[PDB]
Design a protein around this ligand. Structure first.
Ligand SMILES: CC(C)N(CCCNC(=O)Nc1ccc(C(C)(C)C)cc1)C[C@H]1O[C@@H](n2ccc3c(N)ncnc32)[C@H](O)[C@@H]1O
Length: 311
């Protein structure tokens, strides 16, 4: 039990890593998780950054236990010192805050790397930045209800719940492997958010089938749906159209394949198509990453067709 330990900046249980430090995949290992965690805690707390300014931006040897041990001791002592500074007159750091996008990206990486330990069993990454663009574009409020349809190991739900104020966030997933992993991710996410002292809106990861009778009314009372439908066959896409027809006004759907055409002009031969009750717009892709679509339930376009004929 050689070990490295990192103290929480808010008194939660320390993160404990074994030595030699594990490798996650060809591009991520525990050594760098540690270094990046330290650096993010220095951004969280400016005094900490000052206290180890002469240590945080030097490229330690991640293969020497002593070099890594020196980094963690330097950090752990600085934390002890900050916790004393807060005991005095100096006020602590706020505990109600949401994590910045950078920090959240780092947390979700370590949560994933700690939860999904054999990513071969998920055979049968860059989703974070795409989801982040969408979070910036699709404004959400404490009124809204969020769902990720086919939520996987849950990371997109975790991202949105950490970023927005919605009253609730849901993921729904039918396969047992990803649902198993989702339970761990949930566990880890709560651990590390506590560890960093950061807030999240409420969320739930469920096992279930979003095309079932139970989910019909749930979809109808959902105001924000994300669905990566790029590989759904036409049966499933037709099933979802049926579900979305019952959505309240203003309800939003963001997808990769559109559920109604952009050009849709309403006429007598198509007046029952879903295109009659929703605006559709193509959303800008991220330079580095391809088409995404925003559907907003607007029944007034049906109204304007009936008002027009009535003239
Ligand atoms: C590809 C989709 C469908 N899904 C993605 C899992 C991670 N979530 C995710 O990528 N969300 C997301 C990401 C980006 C976007 C945008 C690009 C911004 C539009 C939108 C959504 C895969 C999971 O859906 C599950 N799924 C598929 C059908 C099925 C079912 N009817 N009920 C239950 N779960 C089911 C399937 O078992 C997979 O675990």
């Amino acid at each position: 039990k050689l070990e490295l330990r990192l103290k929480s900046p808010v008194g939660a249980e320390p993160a404990v890593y074994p030595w030699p430090l594990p490798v996650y995949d060809k591009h991520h290992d525990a050594a760098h998780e540690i270094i990046e965690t330290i650096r993010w805690v220095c951004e969280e707390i400016p005094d900490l950054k000052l206290a180890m300014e002469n240590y945080v931006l030097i490229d330690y040897d991640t293969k020497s236990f002593e070099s890594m041990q020196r980094l963690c001791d330097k950090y752990n002592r600085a934390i002890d010192s900050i916790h004393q500074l807060w005991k005095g007159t100096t006020q602590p750091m706020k505990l109600n805050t949401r994590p910045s996008t950078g920090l959240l990206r780092h947390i979700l990486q370590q949560v994933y790397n700690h939860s999904v330990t054999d990513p071969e069993k998920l055979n049968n990454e860059t989703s974070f930045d795409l989801v982040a663009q969408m979070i910036d574009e699709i404004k959400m409020t404490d009124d809204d209800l969020f769902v990720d349809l086919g939520s996987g190991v849950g990371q997109v739900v975790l991202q949105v719940a950490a970023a927005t104020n919605c009253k609730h966030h849901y993921g729904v997933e039918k396969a047992d492997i990803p649902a198993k992993y989702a339970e761990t991710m949930d566990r880890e996410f709560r651990k590390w958010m506590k560890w960093y002292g950061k807030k999240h809106a409420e969320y739930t990861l469920e096992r279930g089938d979003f095309l079932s009778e139970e989910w019909r009314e749930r979809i109808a009372n959902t105001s924000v749906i994300f669905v990566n439908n790029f590989a759904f066959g036409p049966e499933v896409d037709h099933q979802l159209k049926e579900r979305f027809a019952n959505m309240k006004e203003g309800g939003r759907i963001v997808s990769s394949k559109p559920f109604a055409p952009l050009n849709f002009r309403i006429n007598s031969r198509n007046l029952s198509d879903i295109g009659t009750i929703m605006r559709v717009v193509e959303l800008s892709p991220l330079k580095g990453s391809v088409s995404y679509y925003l559907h907003t339930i607007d029944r007034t376009i049906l109204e304007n067709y009936f008002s027009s004929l009535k003239n």
